[PDB]
A paper describes a structure:
The human [name]+ [name] p97, also known as [name], a potential target for cancer therapeutics, plays a vital role in the clearing of misfolded proteins. p97 dysfunction is also known to play a crucial role in several neurodegenerative disorders, such as MultiSystem Proteinopathy 1 (MSP-1) and Familial Amyotrophic Lateral Sclerosis (ALS). pmcp97 is a member of the classic clade of [name]+ ATPases and is an essential cellular enzyme. p97 is composed of six protomers forming a homo-hexamer with an N-terminal domain (NTD) and two tandem [name] domains D1 and D2 (1). p97 is an essential protein in regulating cellular homeostasis from membrane fusion, Endoplasmic Reticulum-Associated Degradation, Mitochondrial-Associated Degradation (MAD), Chromatin-Associated Degradation to NF-κB activation (2). Critical functions for p97 include the translocation and restructuring of proteins from large cellular structures such as organelle membranes and extraction of ubiquitinated client proteins to facilitate their degradation through the ubiquitin-proteasome system. Here, we present cryo-EM structural analyses of four disease mutants p97R155H, p97R191Q, p97A232E, p97D592N, as well as p97E470D, implicated in resistance to the drug CB-5083, a potent p97 inhibitor.
Author numbering:
A (entry chain C): 21 to 707, 728 to 768
B (entry chain D): 270 to 707, 728 to 768
């Protein structure tokens, strides 16, 4: 019915007004690639734009830029009306004006810096009263045409003239300031944003329908994660991207008040939220006001917690009020809040990965002007423990370093500097390198949940175990139909055992990568150092974090360190299977099979592994990784020498047949030593850039075997008899 | 409401409690419900403000001043019963305690029906399957799951059908139906709250899931079913039934399955406490949780309390000798105390299982604690056929598969080993199907290939040692 209603969501083209459609859509509306289109919105106002031909987006969804959502007064998920007008329209005179909210502190002719390299070679349309934003001069200005030839009858053409005024127009309250945070201002959290949208937009955008349908809304969203991960940013963006009244409660600000006055503040907050339409209450830093009532001193604090619980419980569905809260210490929150009816939805705003932090870097540098040598992808790769706040600080420091080299070379001593020199200020990759040099990552200690970068190509040989890992991991998650047809429940666990340096860690990471599943690595020393504080909840938290990351692989590396805590099965006579390992067994037994969490254990001490690991249902797929044979050694050398300029005379299979008892680590050490000899040769010759046959000969001269023949025999013995182990 | 009372100022919450009790006494037979009792009445030893202690004392005074003539019944709800001040749980204040435990599969199916009765479900919706697939869910979790499935159904109908009307009519609401895929999606995104909680239920495994072991099945029937089904014979002959059984033998021979199956046949509640669970609850030095296990078994009578993987417990300090000190410590002494402190007339039966009879501490084996020593050996040739048949019930096995051929080709294999063989053959069949897609019957060739890599999980020396302990384990104690 009425094939002209289009559903609106956030766009993917990071530019000015360019709408994107789906495969049935350009055929249904018979519109071409570079077509001028007219968009019709609510409140009797219009927008003219350019279509973008997209097919692999969805079945029916248009993609709308935040620049032109405000031109139509339409928000996310709203319905829009469209009308193709494939007529070329050229404007003669456009009377254009800035706004005195984003142009303060900037003087001169802002057109030669903003509107010149934004108009030409674009051919974009302009309508009456359109607020379009141009980024430049390490800042962003939204801009307003106020007078021109009849609307729209305007696209960007060279015959369109420009004129400087210097008189910005005041911003009325009818339109929303684009400088405010939106969904385009968050990077690295799209799954979490998707969950937040699914929980929030329907109750708020459609309150009457939701109330009439009589179903429970999620009213207890609790955002949590490490500090500086965008929790406040996400909450304020969700507030802005919906037409919901937003009341903010600050933990410290509430607790700074006198006794009996903070309770009044909470009551007034909830009363105002109930009064003012669908609304969002955001309690930032919830742990400030609501710590655990068992661990707290003053009775005023306990009254605060009880008052918050009462207000949460007295929140009815008829109120159409959604309460979000943010805390970076979710375990310090009083448990009564995290129950049903108060805070039942929990969203983990985790540390961004490499792609996510690259997106954050782009979001923070979009206003900045970067030199051509700036590789934001490289910066994202080189930043590991950084969070969104860390990346914003890094970008700010790089910008300030660039300024420091331009405030002295160019005397910027003028009181209010113009943009004619601000564009000349550019941030080089060296500035980013310097900023990265002086930067303290906050989330270094945090566990990493990401898809690892290592592929099968980084692993030499081991084809059989690659196939077995594929069958054990990929097939249950890719073809559940076969498993349910044949009735067999997939095994949830694999134990890697064998001599050291044979690729046990690489195999787990690579099988994580091929499935494109999240990977969590918990090393034995990490467990033994978290447990020394007698914190039984952190090992539980590891399995919890793996649960929300499904499909995920939970890899316990270096189990030998765990099994060597008290020596082993005998050890001092008492069992080294204690502390964490019993809790690990309990967590393995307490996780459902239908969950896509796969557990992999690795150890190079199969003698002292406790039998309870090997029980069916915990880790019963015993995979033995042996020393590489002659062909696997060639493969390992090829994999390790991918990044090095190896000379053509190097005979890799000669090295493979000259190394017999060497592991993958030993061959990597040989390659590293030969590369280091090449580096030394280059250094000496400076006072050639190809690692040669002679370097490998010299490295092989000092090459050493890290696995004994007795060790090989014992590993082969355990390779045959480790299923027995348990029992005696 | 606990928090609502505690949110008031000092001296005003006491007034609220007094007014509540006065109104209840005034208005006929009445019920006072104190929701979240732990909010207002924590342990007076562990509390800070004197206002809170006055609140607790006022509640105690009001409970004690409640006369029979008042016809007032006070109910209270708490999810932390052990945090309640002990003075409240005594006679005259709160003497009746009801444990609203986690629902089982049938109960959670009933909850799903109660929450979906208003909803319109498609014909593919199998609420029984959803109940089976939800384990740690409680009634609130199931209500949330149903609500999320309904909202997922709406999301696929608010866009396909423009429901943009302000007040939608029912002529299209009926057209909105919740499919089994919506329930599957909701179950995919759902966090069960009671995953860590102990499960008290009748297990699903029957005798048909166990191959062979007919003699131990009969012995378990005599030990468990007869005392609870025919007490008259036992009182006629004057013998008190033994309250305990210890399962010992090589690993993977069905010790867990036997306990669960004997629980199922009696239709009795089953509680499984594994050794690692005990060793991880005890690391917090919580001596009350192991007591709580026996308590929970007491209200679940007739119940079977199964302690699985006692080898892990006995390996905490190595064993009887171990490091020289005794590995019988921590939980095991409290387990012995709890076993000795439970009345015989209670229908709680205790079963222990271990595959390390060498390091089991003798105090377990004392008459009155676990004196029925049942040895589960490796399956023999016919029991292997039975085990293979039991494991292949759910798989489409081809007719050419010779099960007794596999049984006679496997000699030292346990039930776990045969299950591993079946799983490997099934996985080869899955691989064949995957390859052929780019037939739906596990064949003789698959079993041949699986048997090619089949492995024996019990050594001949282990078999000899288990046979030695099968004959001499009653001795054990003494030296
Ligand atoms: N994911 C992100 N995407 C973009 N910018 C981000 C992101 N995370 C943080 N930032 C930036 O870093 C700033 C840090 O503020 P927030 O992360 O919102 O504070 P927070 O997340 O509540 O952490 P707290 O308050 O210290 S516990 C934000 O204002 C953004 O400028
Ligand atoms: N099959 C292999 N192919 C390529 N490189 C390998 C291989 N095996 C080992 N290496 C190298 O040796 C390093 C150690 O590999 P790991 O996966 O950690 O092996 P491991 O079995 O965990 O033994 P350790 O204790 O980690 S040295 C890798 O980072 C590689 O540089
Ligand atoms: N008699 C049997 N009949 C059928 N399946 C069996 C039998 N014995 C063992 N199995 C299989 O092996 C698995 C383990 O059985 P359990 O009852 O756990 O034996 P167990 O003596 O407790 O030894 P573990 O330590 O649990 S492997 C079961 O889940 C079945 O798949
Ligand atoms: Mg914040
Ligand atoms: Mg490693
Ligand atoms: Mg078992």
């Amino acid at each position: 019915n009425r094939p002209n209603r289009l559903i609106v969501d956030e766009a993917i083209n990071e530019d000015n007004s360019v709408v994107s459609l789906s495969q049935p859509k350009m055929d249904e509306l018979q519109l071409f690639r570079g077509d001028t289109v007219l968009l019709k919105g609510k409140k009797r106002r219009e927008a003219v734009c350019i279509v973008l031909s997209d097919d692999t987006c969805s079945d029916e969804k248009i993609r709308m830029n935040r620049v032109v959502r405000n031109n139509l007064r339409v928000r996310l998920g709203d319905v829009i009306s469209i009308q193709p007008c494939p007529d070329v329209k050229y404007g003669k005179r456009i009377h254009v004006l800035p706004i005195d909210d984003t142009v303060e502190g900037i003087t001169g002719n802002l057109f030669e810096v903003y509107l010149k390299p934004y108009f030409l070679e674009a051919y974009r349309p302009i309508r009456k009263g359109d607020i379009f934003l141009v980024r430049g001069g390490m800042r962003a200005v939204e801009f307003k045409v106020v007078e021109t030839d009849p609307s729209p009858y305007c696209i960007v053409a060279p015959d369109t003239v420009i004129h400087c005024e210097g008189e910005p127009i005041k911003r009325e309250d009818e339109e929303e300031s684009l400088n405010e945070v939106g969904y385009d201002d968050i990077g690295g959290c799209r799954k979490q944003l998707a969950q937040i949208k699914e929980m929030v937009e329907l109750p708020l955008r459609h309150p009457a329908l939701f109330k009439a349908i009589g179903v429970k809304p999620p009213r207890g969203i609790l955002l949590y994660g490490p500090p500086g991960t965008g929790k406040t940013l996400i909450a304020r963006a969700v507030a802005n991207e919906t037409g919901a009244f937003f009341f903010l409660i600050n933990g410290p600000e509430i607790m700074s008040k006198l006794a009996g006055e903070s309770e009044s503040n909470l009551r007034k907050a909830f009363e105002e939220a109930e009064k003012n339409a669908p609304a969002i209450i955001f309690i930032d830093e919830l742990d400030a006001i609501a710590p655990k009532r068992e661990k707290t001193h003053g009775e005023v604090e306990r009254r605060i917690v009880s008052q918050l619980l009462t207000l949460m419980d007295g929140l009815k569905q008829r109120a159409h009020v959604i309460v979000m809260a943010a805390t970076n210490r979710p375990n310090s929150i009083d448990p009564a809040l995290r129950r049903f009816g108060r805070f039942d939805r929990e969203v983990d705003i985790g540390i961004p990965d490499a792609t996510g932090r690259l997106e954050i870097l782009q979001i923070h540098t979009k206003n900045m002007k970067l030199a051509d040598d700036v590789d934001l992808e490289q910066v994202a790769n080189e930043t590991h423990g950084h969070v969104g706040a860390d990346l914003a600080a890094l970008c700010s420091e790089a910008a300030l370093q660039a300024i420091r080299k331009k405030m002295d070379l160019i005397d910027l001593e003028d009181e209010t500097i113009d943009a004619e020199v601000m564009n000349s200020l550019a941030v080089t990759m060296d500035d980013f390198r310097w900023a990265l040099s002086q930067s303290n990552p906050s989330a270094l200690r945090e566990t990493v949940v990401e898809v690892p970068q290592v592929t099968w190509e980084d692993i030499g040989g081991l084809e059989d175990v690659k196939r077995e890992l594929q069958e054990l991991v990929q097939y249950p998650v890719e073809h559940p139909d076969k498993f349910l047809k044949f009735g067999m429940t997939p095994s949830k666990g694999v134990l890697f055992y064998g001599p050291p340096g044979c690729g046990k860690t690489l195999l787990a990471k690579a099988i994580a990568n091929e499935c494109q599943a999240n990977f969590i690595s918990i090393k034995g020393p990490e467990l033994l150092t978290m447990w020394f504080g007698e914190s039984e909840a952190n090992v539980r938290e590891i399995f919890d974090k793996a649960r929300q990351a499904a499909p995920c692989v939970l890899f316990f590396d270096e189990l030998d360190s765990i099994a060597k805590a008290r020596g082993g099965n005998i050890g001092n006579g008492g069992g080294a299977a204690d502390r964490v390992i019993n809790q690990i067994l309990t967590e393995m037994d307490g996780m459902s099979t239908k969950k896509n969490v796969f557990i992999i254990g690795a150890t190079n001490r199969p003698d002292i592994i406790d039998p309870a690991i090997l029980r069916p249902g915990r880790l019963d797929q015993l995979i033995y990784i042996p020393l590489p044979d002659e062909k696997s050694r060639v493969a390992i050398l090829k994999a390790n020498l991918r990044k090095s300029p190896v000379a053509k005379d190097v005979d890799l299979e000669f090295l493979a047949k000259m190394t017999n008892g060497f592991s993958g680590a030993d061959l990597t050490e040989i390659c590293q030593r030969a590369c280091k000899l090449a580096i030394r040769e280059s250094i000496e010759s400076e006072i050639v850039p190809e690692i040669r046959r002679d370097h490998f000969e010299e490295a092989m001269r000092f090459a050493r075997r890290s696995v004994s023949d007795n060790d090989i025999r014992k590993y082969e013995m355990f390779a045959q008899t480790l299923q027995q182990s348990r029992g005696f």
